[PDB]
Amino acid sequence: MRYPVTLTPAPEGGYMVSFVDIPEALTQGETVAEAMEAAKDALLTAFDFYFEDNELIPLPSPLNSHDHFIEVPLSVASKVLLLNAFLQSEITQQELARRIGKPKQEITRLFNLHHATKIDAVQLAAKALGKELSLVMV
Amino acid sequence: MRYPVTLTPAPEGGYMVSFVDIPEALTQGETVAEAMEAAKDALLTAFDFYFEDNELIPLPSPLNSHDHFIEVPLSVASKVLLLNAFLQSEITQQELARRIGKPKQEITRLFNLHHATKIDAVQLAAKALGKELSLVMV
């Protein structure tokens, strides 16, 4: 859900931004507010790299009392959970497409964060992999 | 999540559908298979009445191992949790729109199951009511 971000003071001023669970997400900001804003772009585009290399996305560490974090939207979170389950299911994209009865070009559209997908379509893909996706609130 | 269904033989032939948690969703079918399928529109059509009557939607009772059930899709499920949270907050539609910084015309689509709504918008509205919505995959 929420990825902790470590902010390091910069010797030339401002802050350098880094995530403990995602080494590829690096950026910086003038101020904590700006650094946090940039931190959300760094995390999501670092996710883009995992999606093309079909490598598992690390899950967030537990959050301490005084730590900043980035909460990924539900749309991103659902695709992240789907990608990890799909990579561990050991089936291909062609096979998954067959199971949902849809052409291969929306499997490509499914495992891409820049393409909008309806949450119900993500739910059906999880079901085809033997997984149930559900909601919790507070 | 999943609402338990009661299957009762019909004196007129066929089988009769009823939900333990939703007394208003009742219909029937010639066979168990058809009565279950017909039951899923009856539950969704009963939900529409809760949405326009602004009444809290009862949540499902626990499921035995050997229990029949109807599973609402994630899109409807998210809106059900949202309507219950909005009804218990005792604020108006104008106020919720103000807190998420969107016009009123997107609140009305939030509380309607026939209008598709993006999950990220449902997350934002829940947050404006002090609730955090998250996904579980099992």
| Cβ-Cβ contacts under 8 Å for B98 (sequence gap 6 or more) | none
Of B1, B131, B135, the CB nearest to A78: B135
Instruction: Please classify residue A13 by burial: count the beta carbons closer than 10 Å to its beta carbon, then call 0-12 exposed, 13-18 middle and 19+ buried.
Output: exposed
CB-based contact A63:A53 (threshold 8 Å) = no
Structure tokens at B73: 């899709």
The Cα–Cα gap between B48 and B88 comes to 18
Structure tokens at A73: 């939207």
Structure tokens at A100: 């949902």
DSSP-based three-state secondary structure for A78 = helix
- Please identify which residue in the block is written with the tokens 């899923």: B40
Interface membership of B77 toward A (CB under 8 Å): yes
Choose among B19, B53, B47: nearest CA to B113: B47
The Cα–Cα gap between A29 and A27 comes to 7
Q: Which of A127, A135, A136 to mutate to test the interface with B (most CBs of B within 10 A)?
A: A135
For B42, other C-beta atoms within 10 Å of its C-beta total 20
Choose among A78, A73, A80: nearest CA to B125: A73
Of A85, A118, A137, the CB nearest to B131: A137
Query: Domain-by-domain residue ranges, chain A?
Result: 2-72, 73-131
Chains A–B, number of C-beta pairs less than 8 Å apart:
71
Q: Do A133 and B136 touch (CB under 8 A)?
A: yes
Resolution reading in Å: 2.3
CB-based contact A56:A47 (threshold 8 Å) = no
- Please identify which residue in the block is written with the tokens 């998210």: B78
CB-based contact A100:B46 (threshold 8 Å) = no
The Cα–Cα gap between B138 and A78 comes to 13
Percent helix, percent strand, percent coil in chain B, to nearest 5 = 45, 20, 40
Instruction: Please classify residue A134 by burial: count the beta carbons closer than 10 Å to its beta carbon, then call 0-12 exposed, 13-18 middle and 19+ buried.
Output: middle
Choose among B137, B125, B121: nearest CA to A57: B137
The Cα–Cα gap between A114 and B26 comes to 42
The Cα–Cα gap between A64 and B105 comes to 39
Q: Do A74 and B119 touch (CB under 8 A)?
A: yes
